[PDB]
Design a protein around this ligand. Sequence first.
Ligand SMILES: Nc1ncnc2c1ncn2[C@@H]1O[C@H](COP(=O)(O)OP(=O)(O)NP(=O)(O)O)[C@@H](O)[C@H]1O
Ligand SMILES: *[C@@H]1O[C@H](CO)[C@@H](O)[C@H](O)[C@H]1NC(C)=O
Ligand SMILES: *[C@@H]1O[C@H](CO)[C@@H](O)[C@H](O)[C@H]1NC(C)=O
Ligand SMILES: *[C@@H]1O[C@H](CO)[C@@H](O)[C@H](O)[C@H]1NC(C)=O
Ligand SMILES: *[C@@H]1O[C@H](CO)[C@@H](O)[C@H](O)[C@H]1NC(C)=O
Ligand SMILES: *[C@@H]1O[C@H](CO)[C@@H](O)[C@H](O)[C@H]1NC(C)=O
Ligand SMILES: *[C@@H]1O[C@H](CO)[C@@H](O)[C@H](O)[C@H]1NC(C)=O
Ligand SMILES: [Mg+2]
Lengths: 214, 942
Amino acid sequence: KPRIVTSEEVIIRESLLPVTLQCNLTSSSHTLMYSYWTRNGVELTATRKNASNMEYRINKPRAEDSGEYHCVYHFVSAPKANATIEVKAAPDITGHKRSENKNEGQDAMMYCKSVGYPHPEWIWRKKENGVFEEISNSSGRFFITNKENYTELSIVNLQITEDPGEYECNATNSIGSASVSTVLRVRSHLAPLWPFLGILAEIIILVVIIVVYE
Amino acid sequence: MEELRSLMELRGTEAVVKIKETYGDTEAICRRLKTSPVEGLPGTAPDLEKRKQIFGQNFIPPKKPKTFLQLVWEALQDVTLIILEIAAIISLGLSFYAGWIEGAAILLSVICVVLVTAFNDWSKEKQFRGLQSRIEQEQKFTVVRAGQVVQIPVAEIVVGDIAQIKYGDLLPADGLFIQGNDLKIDESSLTGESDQVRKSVDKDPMLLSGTHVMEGSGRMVVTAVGVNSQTGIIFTLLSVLQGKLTKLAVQIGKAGLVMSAITVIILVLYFTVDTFVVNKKPWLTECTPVYVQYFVKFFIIGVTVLVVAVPEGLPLAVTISLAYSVKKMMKDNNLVRHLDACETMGNATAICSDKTGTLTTNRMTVVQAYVGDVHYKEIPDPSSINAKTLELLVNAIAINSAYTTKILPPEKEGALPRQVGNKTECGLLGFVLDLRQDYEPVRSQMPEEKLYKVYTFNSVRKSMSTVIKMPDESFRMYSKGASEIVLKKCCKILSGAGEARVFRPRDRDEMVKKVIEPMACDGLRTICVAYRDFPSSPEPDWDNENDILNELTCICVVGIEDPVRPEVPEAIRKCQRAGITVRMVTGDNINTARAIAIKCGIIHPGEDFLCLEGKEFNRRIRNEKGEIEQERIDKIWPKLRVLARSSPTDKHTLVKGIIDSTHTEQRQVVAVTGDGTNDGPALKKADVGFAMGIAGTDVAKEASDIILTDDNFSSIVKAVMWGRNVYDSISKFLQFQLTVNVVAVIVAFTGACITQDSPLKAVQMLWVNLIMDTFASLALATEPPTETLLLRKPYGRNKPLISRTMMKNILGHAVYQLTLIFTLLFVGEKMFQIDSGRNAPLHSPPSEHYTIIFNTFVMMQLFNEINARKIHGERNVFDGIFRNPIFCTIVLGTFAIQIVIVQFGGKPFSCSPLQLDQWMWCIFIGLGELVWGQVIATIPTS
Ligand SMILES: Nc1ncnc2c1ncn2[C@@H]1O[C@H](COP(=O)(O)OP(=O)(O)NP(=O)(O)O)[C@@H](O)[C@H]1O
Ligand SMILES: *[C@@H]1O[C@H](CO)[C@@H](O)[C@H](O)[C@H]1NC(C)=O
Ligand SMILES: *[C@@H]1O[C@H](CO)[C@@H](O)[C@H](O)[C@H]1NC(C)=O
Ligand SMILES: *[C@@H]1O[C@H](CO)[C@@H](O)[C@H](O)[C@H]1NC(C)=O
Ligand SMILES: *[C@@H]1O[C@H](CO)[C@@H](O)[C@H](O)[C@H]1NC(C)=O
Ligand SMILES: *[C@@H]1O[C@H](CO)[C@@H](O)[C@H](O)[C@H]1NC(C)=O
Ligand SMILES: *[C@@H]1O[C@H](CO)[C@@H](O)[C@H](O)[C@H]1NC(C)=O
Ligand SMILES: [Mg+2]
């Protein structure tokens, strides 16, 4: 089994200093053909050379870059040697819906897609008189699906009395936490009726004035 | 083009001798042309078509109109559109360093506008052309084809046609004189010499196109027509309201310019100060393109303010109104030769008219007779007359009157008999027929040869006489006179049992008071019929007609009445109600003129109005030496209602005296209704001159601005109404457009001061510009007139365009719209619960907030377009809305296009689809516009 010595883990802060990750193939009796850096199982471009020792320099380290880096070694007749260098960062939400407008008795969907490593545990909160209390799945009409970097909250058969409010995704991990919020609005089925009554009142008063004065 | 073109060049007696050398006489010319002789013309269609193509030419120059592509090319070259296009091109190019969807949109929108505007022009000019065509159709000339005398358009005259020439006619083509009587022509239009040339076969048979037939009658054969004519050679080889509107246009334009510049500079300054000074940011030229993008957007919005602020097409609107009124005016019997005289008719403050034809139907009938020393208010029975005097009376009337005046049979559809010739003569003939006799046998016993001494009727003598040699060894003289000239001359009366009683001054003075004066007071022209006997003297000296027309014997006295038209009393009442005084100019004696004027209502019985004659008028206006002085005229004209026994130049004197007097506080605008051969100059001195179409000389029609096709005074009133309408239409259009550009501009500026963008984007602003300029002008400038326009005094020349009520409406409706739009722009997020589109980042998607603002703006503008139709504080807005289909079509089409724009086509127009609730709310605000209009209509302006 080949021996690989790797650099220590690095926590990406707001500092702009470049970060270098190192792998050294200290013991190998096999003929090496090549080696390559990968992140989350994705090959990194232009990282295939002789490279008996691997260096990766990141000039502007950011939260989006942190991940599970691997330096894989491939030989003639020996299994590839992967090793592991893990880079952590605070979580941060990239995209989220500003508002959700749906008619009553319909389906509502919200999501908070974020980035970072470790993958953040996702919890949803609802505004209750100024304090973000937890969401209660009492009626069985809330459905929360959690993934690595994605979360999805779905509501079915919207009721105009309880659902309208503001919902937050808290997104915690081992470095920090990051939360954003969304506003949900439920529209009644009787909305068009009131302006129609206003129009009728306008027409009748207009007709009354015109007829009376002439 | 043939030798006939070279035939012209008489200049004395060259043409006659040239004909005698080359052709022989005129008969050889007639047979050379393959044309039937004086009897008639073949008139066969293929032959006339062929000789129209090859022998002559259509008597119409083409005048060369323009095309549509030239119109769009001229519309495209507007400077501000070029600025907008280059800004859009820069933005589109820089967006690549889907933002392009903005810039491209602008370009396409521009290509739309420069189309529609161009189309508008191509429409309105078309209308004008149509009118001109109709004018060319009303010009007709009398020709002889297939032995029949028919009227054909002047454009149909071809070489070889036999054209009949009457006095007052305008010669349409170059021709040869064949036969006629005492034909005198004025050739001042080609030689500059204003004397009447006498045309005869043996001296000068040339007739030139464009000359005026001054006297006589005859026939001619056409030789040269069109560009080949003499007058065609010279043709070849070579507004208060508009001026007052232009100043308003330029003032508003410069105000909009300075406002747009201020907006652009304040945006640039605030953006730079905030981005650099406060939030300290390095230049970082690597990211420098974004900065300039932020500038370019600003620049674009500045331009979109300017195109809305400057009124383009404001002074043009007047013409549009005319282009959609003139045709309809033709259905009220007003053919408009000069369009400038239309709106001038709105300001008319005096009308000078002539009695016969205009106010009286010219249908002369006899209703009173005095024959037999017994007044007869009704036509007597033929047996009830005195013995043996009826034969003498009918003989005198038949032989005396010209034999050409033949009363045509009443073969018209259930109509009165048609009268041809002198009206007095044919009236007396009808009176003779009314007594149950027939002048046809008496006229058949006497051809023209037997009569040997006839004095042609002329206005100097006011009488006409003839001499007959039938009695053996004697002569008999028959005379008809004005009943004032000849009553002095007669020395005996045939009365009683037929024996002559000696007439004396003593009983003459009382008989003039008994019958003649009341006869005139009943509005009856008085004509006296008399005779005399000449014995077989060695030689009666007919040359000294002063003594020959004396010692007659009065056969009878007859009254003739031309009834006043039924419409002209009410028409004159309506004219006087609208502040337009009316005067009458006539050639009758003062009694009959005064009676007819009282009948028409021109002069009330108990009023102080002068009814002085022509001779007294001339004597008064030239008291000092023998020249006309304005100060002397200044006393007569203000109270001159009826002018009788006038002369052709008296009308011109009166017209100029009224038109150029400085005595009145307000400048006077006169409108003379003359019609005559010698009535040319007067029509040119007055502001607008009316001519008569049914019975009018071509010379009178040539110099007139408007032609009345019914020969009725009432139609004149119509003209006034139409003229006033034009002014009103402009006003209401000006009431709408201004309001829009008072709101839009302000809104943009206010946005520019608080937010960093305007709620109305570029293409939306181009849509609003299209609504406010073209569609608004078509909808509002073309409004049908109403009779109520005749209930206000004529407007002065100096008066502001924007009145008090117009400005009150502008301010009030702008206030309402501004309040609603500001309230929406600042609190819509909470009123509708739709989030807030304010401070949107660059390249952001459209939001519902700004779409609601834009939609409610357009709806308020449409309902204000409905409100704009009433200027004079009228409460009932919907009065007569279905009389104008263009208004309804335009408003509903704009509504439908708005519904399509808001829902579909969202990204290019910066719009997002709206639900039903928000649409109903927008329409609710739109109707609140009308409610607030009714609210503001109750505020007293004074
Ligand atoms: N055939 C005639 N014989 C004799 N006298 C005539 C004849 N016809 C008209 N008169 C008279 O002679 C004068 C000619 O006037 P005329 O030119 O016909 O009209 P006016 O009196 O000038 N009025 P107006 O038609 O309005 O211009 C008048 O006094 C007539 O009454
Ligand atoms: C790791 O490899 C680099 C690159 O060759 C080398 O400079 C460094 O000394 C190596 N470190 C160790 C501990 O082997
Ligand atoms: C690099 O080259 C050296 C020297 O030939 C060799 O021993 C080693 O296996 C190579 N490594 C590769 C090709 O990855
Ligand atoms: C390398 O091999 C190990 C074997 O345990 C595996 O866990 C790891 O995921 C591999 N690396 C990659 C990048 O697949
Ligand atoms: C999350 O991780 C998956 C791994 O397959 C990747 O495809 C996706 O782009 C990542 N980001 C988001 C926002 O889901
Ligand atoms: C809520 O309860 C319902 C009960 O039917 C269940 O289907 C659903 O998954 C629950 N959701 C959560 C987030 O617990
Ligand atoms: C997520 O939850 C933490 C832990 O309670 C809370 O304090 C915080 O407000 C949330 N995160 C953010 C970034 O607000
Ligand atoms: Mg006359």
